[PDB]
């Protein structure tokens, strides 16, 4: 049967597109853990994992298979709910945030004029997902870092949210594609350099990555909130943490570094000049270039996440709350009024085309 096969793929192709999409994110997420130790290795004159798989490539899979196959510590015989809600909510929150990231022109699963709100809303759910981790499961180390955790990723969620809106104010749109496509002649790293630093500082603190890493303060709270978590609850939560590092790295490239836009349009046209536009081979290469353009930009921040961790000590917790409220908030509330003033003064109020 070839008539019942060619139309069968026509009934299943879009599911495979998602599966191809799903694997695309997980591969980056899986190998961010491997890339972290390597990058943090040579920076410390170490070597990093090179003896688990050829040149250490099969290092994440070893940890995933090791952890997933351990005994699960439970308060009672059938008490799986408590040690699963915290990791599951955090994972789904950051997995759904990938429904809006566009890999190119309109290459997003969700395209709506409210992409920014949906992206920020899904961030809030993961925040609520984390505070469940340190809740009612006795009180030794998880509940110590839950009022501490909640008071941190609440406060910086203000500064992170304001930065997003200031970018969306410049384009007058809440659609990520419009934000990406509107940076053709300028990258918001040039005009909004302070915001990129403020965004990245808030991006680090929201994900609880060091230097703002008092959530899992290793020298203070053993393993922090994951001291109870083991085996699969640990994998889900750990996978949740790194998807944010990929997402926040990608978001920084989308907002300030133009997203999938090429570094140079001259080189970009030369490469696409070699492939006939009437054959599908052109559109395979085109997706690779635009996604690779986004990947290189997103790589540098994924490198930057490890880079900052290997060169900056941890920040005392009380100074974190006094930082965003006293310093970052007034600055981010000033550029939110500095931007409209300049745009209106020269009669350049933005519109959506």
């Amino acid at each position: 049967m070839l008539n019942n096969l060619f139309d069968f793929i026509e009934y299943i192709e879009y599911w495979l597109i998602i599966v191809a999409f799903v694997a695309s994110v997980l591969i980056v997420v899986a190998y961010l853990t491997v890339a972290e130790r390597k990058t943090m290795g040579y920076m410390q004159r170490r070597l990093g994992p090179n003896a688990v798989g050829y040149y250490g490539v099969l290092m994440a899979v070893a940890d995933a298979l090791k952890l997933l196959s351990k005994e699960i510590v439970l308060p009672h015989n059938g008490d799986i709910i408590y040690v699963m809600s915290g990791p599951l909510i955090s994972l789904f929150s950051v997995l759904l945030s990938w429904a809006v990231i566009p890999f190119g022109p309109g290459l997003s699963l969700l395209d709506s004029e409210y992409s920014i709100i949906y992206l920020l809303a899904s961030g809030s759910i993961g925040v609520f997902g984390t505070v469940i981790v340190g809740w009612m499961s006795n009180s030794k180390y998880t509940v110590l870092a839950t009022v501490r955790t909640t008071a941190q990723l609440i406060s910086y969620e203000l500064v992170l949210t304001t930065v997003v809106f200031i970018i969306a104010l410049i384009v007058s749109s809440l659609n990520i594609n419009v934000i990406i496509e509107s940076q053709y002649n300028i990258w918001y790293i040039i005009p909004f350099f302070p915001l990129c630093l403020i965004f990245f500082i808030s991006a680090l603190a929201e994900t609880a990555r060091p230097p703002f890493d008092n959530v899992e303060a290793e020298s203070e709270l053993v393993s922090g909130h994951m001291t109870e978590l083991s085996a699969s609850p640990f994998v889900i939560f750990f996978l949740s943490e790194y998807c944010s590092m990929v997402l926040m790295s990608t978001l920084t490239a989308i907002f300030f570094f133009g997203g999938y836009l090429p570094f140079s349009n001259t080189i970009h046209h030369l490469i696409l000049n070699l492939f006939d536009q009437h054959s599908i081979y052109y559109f395979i290469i085109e997706g690779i270039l635009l996604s690779g353009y986004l990947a290189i930009k997103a790589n540098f921040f994924m490198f930057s996440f490890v880079w900052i961790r290997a060169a900056a000590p941890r920040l005392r917790y009380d100074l974190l709350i006094l930082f965003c409220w006293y310093v970052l908030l007034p600055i981010v509330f000033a550029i939110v009024v500095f931007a409209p003033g300049i745009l209106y003064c020269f009669d350049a109020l933005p519109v959506i085309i």
Partner: protein, 50 residues
């Protein structure tokens, strides 16, 4: 002294975005064009000589 071993994980992460971008761009474009070829499957999938 560029350590190429540390760059190995980034190449796969580079290929991580490419697989999503390469498949999504080519598959979505291919399907959309195919459905505009006509009002029926007998002409959608049959490449015309003329």
């Amino acid at each position: 002294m560029i350590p190429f071993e540390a760059l190995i994980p980034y190449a796969i992460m580079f290929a991580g975005f490419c697989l999503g971008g390469g498949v999504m761009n080519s598959a979505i474009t291919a399907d959309i064009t195919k459905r505009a070829r006509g009002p029926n499957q007998e002409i959608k999938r049959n490449v015309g000589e003329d």
